[PDB]
Ligand binder design. Structure first.
Ligand SMILES: [Zn+2]
Ligand SMILES: [Zn+2]
Ligand SMILES: [Zn+2]
Ligand SMILES: [Zn+2]
Lengths: 6, 98
């Protein structure tokens, strides 16, 4: 599973 | 600009490092800590919005403010409109300030 950064 | 997932954790509302749901058409993303996961899941991961919080069956009705959701057996009476554009909320929220 992937992550994103905000 | 258009992206497929949201910029804030669906559980707590804060930004940062978020795991993205793999369910087709799901835009939800979450802190690992907020899901009580220790590491990003290996391979495919579908978020808790897709399963009924009462029984694990496939969800058909969805809180718009948190990952609580309800299968066909448990959805009646689960959600009410809120003051934010009538968006539906589960019992975890004050409908006047969801
Ligand atoms: Zn969070
Ligand atoms: Zn999802
Ligand atoms: Zn259910
Ligand atoms: Zn909710």
């Amino acid at each position: 599973a992937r992550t994103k950064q905000t | 600009p258009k992206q497929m997932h949201e910029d804030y954790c669906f559980q707590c509302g804060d930004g940062g490092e978020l795991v993205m749901c793999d369910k087709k058409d799901c835009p939800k993303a979450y802190h690992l800590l907020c899901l009580n996961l220790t590491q990003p899941p290996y391979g495919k991961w579908e978020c808790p919005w897709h399963q009924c919080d009462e029984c694990s069956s496939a969800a058909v009705s969805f809180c718009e403010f948190c990952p609580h959701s309800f299968c066909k057996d448990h959805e009646k009476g689960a959600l009410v409109p809120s003051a934010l554009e009538g968006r539906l909320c589960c019992s975890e929220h004050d409908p006047m300030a969801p």
